[model samples]
Each structure stands twice: as structure tokens, then as C-alpha cells.
Target: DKHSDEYKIRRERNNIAVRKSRDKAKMRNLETQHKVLELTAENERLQKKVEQLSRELSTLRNLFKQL
Candidate 1:
């Protein structure tokens, strides 16, 4: 009976530790997902800006050729 009780206590402690570790991992994953979303949005905005600049440059080049 004494050994059985000790085994149960150790098992419970291990279960608690496992749950804590899993929770920490889940939080980290969520944070990473959010960062990815933010970076994607920023990338899209920068891409549009680049396109606009390219169009402007082409227009300027055409005007220069005419002059």
C-alpha cells in the first residue's frame, strides 16, 4: 500500500508538468501565428508601393524620351 501511494503521487506530479509544458507551447505557437499575419500584411503593402513607383518611373521615362 505504501509503494502504491508513492507511485500515484509521482504520476500526478508528472501529469501536472506535462500540462504546463503543453500550455506554454500552445501560447508560443499563437504568438508566432500572429507575427506571421502581421508580416504578411506589411509585405503586401510594400509590394503595392513598389508597383506604384514602377509605374511612375515608366511614365517619367516616356516623357523624357518625348523631350
Candidate 2:
């Protein structure tokens, strides 16, 4: 009976540790997803800026040729 009690206590502690580890991993994953969202938005904004600049450059070049 004494050995059984010790085994039960050890098992419970291990279960707690596993739960803690899983929770930490979940939080890390959530943070990673948030960062990815921010990066994706930034990438889209830069792409639009590049497109706008390219159009402006083309227009300027055409004017220069006319002159």
C-alpha cells in the first residue's frame, strides 16, 4: 500500500508537468501566429508602395522622353 501511494504521487506530479509544458507551447504558438499576421500585413503594404513607385517612375520617364 505504501509503494502504491508513492507511485500515485509521482504519476500526479508528472501529469502536472506535462500540462504545464503543453500550456507553454500553446502560448508560444499563439505568439508566432500573431507575428506572422503582422509580417503578412507589412509585406502587402510594401508591395503596394513598390507598385505605386514603379508607376510614378514610368510616367516620369515618358515625360523625359517627350522633352
Candidate 3:
């Protein structure tokens, strides 16, 4: 019978493993999303820095005025 001690113990263990695995997978997915967001923000910040540097270089070059 399903209510037997052996069956109940095994079922409980199996259910616990299944739940743990599900939670592990969910945490991994969330971590990946966080990393992706961080990288995207970093890339945007770098792009802005590059643009600012380029503008500064152009301005300095114009100030030299063909010297």
C-alpha cells in the first residue's frame, strides 16, 4: 500500500530532491540574468566614455590649429 512506511519515506525523499533541483535551477537562471544586466550596463558606460574621449580629442586638435 502507498501508505506503507517504506513507500512514504522514499516518496518524501524523492519529492525533496525534485524541489531542491528546481530551486537550484531557478537560482542559476536568476544569477545569469544578473550577470547579463551588469555586463550590458558596463558596456553602455564604456561607450559613453569612448564618445567623451573622442570629443575631447577633436576639440584639442582644433585648438592646435594646424601647428
Candidate 4:
């Protein structure tokens, strides 16, 4: 079987399989890291907006007009 031309075809195909697996893994790993930072930043911005809106609303209603 080692001397058959089918061996070359098997090796080429298997090598390509390995490359694809490793490529997809590293690509996903970075994507997760990128998304984590972006998502966290979005939450912080949203929380800040809530705080600002609540404070201004309170002031408008004369509930916090200590200024």
C-alpha cells in the first residue's frame, strides 16, 4: 500500500485538513477576544447613559436641585 499512488493523494488531503483545523481555531480565538472587549465597552457606555439620564430627570423634577 505504501508504494501505491493513492498514498500521495492521502498525504496531500490530510495535510490540508490539518491546516484548515489550525487556521479556524486561531481565527475564532482572536474573534472571541475582540468581541469581549467590544461588548464590555458597550455595557459601560450604556450604564453611564442610564446614570446620566436618571440624574438629569431627578433634577428636572426638583428632586435633586442641590445645585
Where in model 1 is the C-alpha error above 4 Å? 1-3
Model 1, 1-67: lDDT tens digits are: 6479889999899999999999999999999999999999999999999999999999999999998
Writing each residue's lDDT as its tens digit, candidate 4 over 1-67 gives: 9877999899989999999999999999999999999999999999999999999898788954555
What TM-score, over all chains together, does every model reach? 0.81, 0.82, 0.70, 0.68
lDDT of 4: 0.94
RMSD to native, candidate 3: 2.6
Clashing residue pairs in candidate 3 are none
* Superposed Cα deviation of residue 17, candidate 1 (Å): 1.0
* Cα RMSD, each candidate: 2.2, 2.2, 2.6, 3.5
- The model with the greater TM-score, 2 or 4, is 2
Q: Candidate 2, clashing residue pairs? A: none
Tally clashes: model 4: 0
Q: Point out the worst 10-residue segment of candidate 3 by lDDT.
A: 58-67
The collision pairs in model 4 are: none
Q: Kindly give the stretch of ten consecutive residues in candidate 1 with the minimal lDDT sum.
A: 1-10
* lDDT score at residue 24, model 1, on the 0-100 scale: 100
lDDT of 2 at 46: 100
Model 2, position 18, has a per-residue lDDT of 100
